[model samples]
Target chain A: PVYMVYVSQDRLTPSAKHAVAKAITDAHRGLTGTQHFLAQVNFNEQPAGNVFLGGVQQGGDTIFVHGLHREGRSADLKGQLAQRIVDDVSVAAEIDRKHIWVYFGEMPAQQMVEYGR
Target chain B: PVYMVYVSQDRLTPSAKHAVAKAITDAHRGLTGTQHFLAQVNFNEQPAGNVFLGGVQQGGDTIFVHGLHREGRSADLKGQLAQRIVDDVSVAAEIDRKHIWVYFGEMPAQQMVEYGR
Candidate 1:
């Protein structure tokens, strides 16, 4: 699975990036028992004014966590995954829980050919 | 709906970025028959060495199109959306179709609180 951490420009420092990535990796591994190395995290910073909320630009400090996972996870497991993201990412990024949003997309395992498999 | 267009750094020129964004906007509006202003496109470029595939670093040129849409779209519509992305984005960005991967996450329109809603 790959987690895309999207934030506003200058919102996260290098250290914060590492902490957020680690938090995401640990949460996914701890909850799903996936291999630690299999979790990939990417930090994408949106330039100022690129982010909007409520149809207005400069939408303040918001973090969007977008993840891709293989299908077949139970509803319970998926719910837990989203909660962990909210809990862990907020603390890691020093942002409020309400400011973080999560969305996950599932793909058939056969459709993904990453890691040479 | 928001479309996040992820690409490797230096893979797209300024003009190419505009074309790609336009392609995605048109595809979403044309196929979904949604308001043109409702379609949002964001370009996030991965640093030169930040991209990897198959367990290797710098895994060549790849474009990941991640989109978030409201729930209730049919499977057929979604399939056409993905194909249009591959076909139009390839022509606009001048990238091969094989290098592009599309994923869409469906969220309830109520869950998304954007645009002042």
Candidate 2:
């Protein structure tokens, strides 16, 4: 599983990228215990032409996320999880959470193969 | 809802990225049919430390895709679709399938809010 935070493609520095990724990672671990589960931070950047908001190409607010994990947790737990991101990731957007969206998906571990076996 | 692609952070040009993005989009629409479903591409670039394979950090192969659509397609249909990527994306990687990985998740329309209301 990965804690993926996709920020709008901008002039943010490389070091700052790691800072933001880890910030969300820590929040995720806090919410879902590190040892009991697996996670990593993958920072993504989306440029204007590539992203859309309000059905118009590249709206002012730009944050879309996908976090994957094993299915089993209650929606209550997961629902609050988005808030952690809403709080932590904003250190970078640096938001009322208008255009931000977070989606969590459950995947059977067997379905994912990290490397060629 | 999106034909998202995550390729290892490499030195590919912007034009080439779209070529690959659209290639997969076309393939996906070909498989699922554009009218019956909705799909767009979000291409991602990941660094070594950020991606893992086979319990190891940054495995040799580096392509992870998340394409979303409504559930209902047969396993057989989706299975053959991976081959389309194997055949088509190879046009860019210049290799046969083996390094690429695509995971599809079904998201009900009500659950996904593309632009925050």
Candidate 3:
């Protein structure tokens, strides 16, 4: 599974968040097996400081979206997700594309069993 | 080794940073073997949004100081560090104590050789 993280400025108006959300949803409109996936949104209310160590700046909103297929994939979904985020959010220009962090982890089969059990 | 991470607001005045630094230094005075340690500071200039997923808010200043001895330790240096920070930084109250993040990692002996190599 893959996780996509996004962090933006705090002063964004409610309408701004809505606009960004709409763009993201529209961008992901129809992809095979995408309906089985899940998307989550998170927002942070505080600004991070500018201390760089080990070449990583500390703090910002981290959006994590998990569950994307890895085998026989053709859509280049990771790039697609990033593009969608950038296009939808007005604060996209301020973000450091290099620092837009993402991580992947395995979803155990037991999780589904736990859900049903 | 132990690493301590600190995150605070970005609008902190230069004097405020100085004051906080002073407090932290004063708090660490005369600790055994601590003088051999290295402390690095980082600042992030953006505020994090309030989107909680998996119980973690996505962004902020992540102060990471490494190189503290683990065996035969005392003075509760971690608590001392946290207290000094809270006392010195004006925006300390806004932080979530539970979320005051820290991580411990090993320092390879080869790193010192690489520095000279």
The lDDT for every candidate, in the order shown, is 0.77, 0.62, 0.37
After superposition, which runs of candidate 2 have C-alpha atoms over 4 Å from their true positions? A1-3, A11-61, A67-102, A107-117, B35-37, B48-61
Question: Evaluated with lDDT, which candidate comes out highest?
Answer: 1
> Candidates 1 and 3: which is better by DockQ?
1
Give the higher-lDDT candidate: 2 or 3.
2
Q: Is candidate 2 or candidate 3 better by TM-score?
A: 2
Report how far residue A1 has shifted in candidate 2, in Å: 12
Better of 1 and 3 by lDDT: 1
Question: Mind giving the per-residue lDDT tens digits that candidate 3 earns over B1-117?
Answer: 222223444534545444444434444443333431222233323345443448877654443333222344444755555455544443432334443343433222211111011
Q: How many collisions between residues are there in candidate 1?
A: 3
User: Highest TM-score: which candidate?
Assistant: 1
lDDT of 1 by residue, A1-56 (tens): 87777787678776777777778888888999988767767667767688778888
- For each candidate in turn, the TM-score is 0.61, 0.56, 0.35
Q: Number of the top candidate by DockQ?
A: 2
The residue ranges of model 1 lying beyond 4 angstroms of the native Cα positions read A5-66, A74-117
What docking grade applies to model 3?
incorrect
| DockQ class, candidate 1 | incorrect
